[PDB]
Amino acid sequence: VIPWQTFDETIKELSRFKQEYSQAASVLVGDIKTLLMDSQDKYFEATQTVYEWC
Amino acid sequence: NNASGKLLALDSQLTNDFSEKSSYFQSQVDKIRKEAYAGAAAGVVAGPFGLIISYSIAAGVVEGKLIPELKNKLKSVQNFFTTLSNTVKQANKDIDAAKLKLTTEIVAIGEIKTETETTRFYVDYDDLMLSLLKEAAKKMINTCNEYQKRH
């Protein structure tokens, strides 16, 4: 008369979706953070080399 | 650069999983109340004495001991989350200060290397009394003395 098991299955299935996409998006945004910092190091080194030659 | 991206990936997962645990808590408290007050209604195999002796035990143990203990455990999880967020926020400042120190020293060394290369080219005129080379050497003496005074 009180469907508690279907309620728990629904809550856990809505809660697994969010865990999956958080774990997927966080790794990719951290990778983009690493790439942007690497690009800023390469930019600094190139413009400093040309500055010292000039 | 790799650790500074791992740190962002940890911080975002931390802030999402804390909210999912905070919703798990509220869905679990209602399950405890459902089980307790549904099992206490089976004290009708005796009279109303058996009914009050079941609802008193249920509403005493669940509302007086179990739910405040779960709330204290959740408050502990909240304080842990705040401490770990401050740890990540301090690690970012340490990494940024180290990188700024290194790039400032690269620029300061390049200011010496430019004068050294200019003097090395002025030597190639094969004239040691050339005023341009004398002035470049007098400039390098002051540059090297200022670098030794700074370190």
Author numbering:
A (entry chain A): 34 to 87
B (entry chain B): 142 to 292
Quoted from the paper:
E. coli cytolysin A (ClyA), also known as hemolysin (HlyE) or silent hemolysin A (SheA), belongs to the α-PFT class. ClyA is a 34 kDa soluble monomer, containing mainly α-helices with only one β-tongue that transforms into α-helical elements in the pore complexes.
The crystal structure of the ClyA pore complex was previously solved as a dodecamer at 3.3 Å. With the cryo-EM density map, we were able to re-assign the side chain in parallel to, rather than pointing toward the hydrophobic membrane environment. Based on the comparison, it is obvious that the binding of mercury atoms pushes away the C-terminus of the αG helix with a movement distance of 4.6 Å at the Cα of R291. Extensive hydrogen bonds and salt bridges, spanning from the transmembrane regions to the distal soluble regions, mediate the interaction between neighboring protomers within the dodecamer, which is also observed in the crystal structure. The inner diameters near the extracellular edge of the pore are 70, 72 and 77 Å for the dodecamer, the tridecamer, and the tetradecamer, respectively.
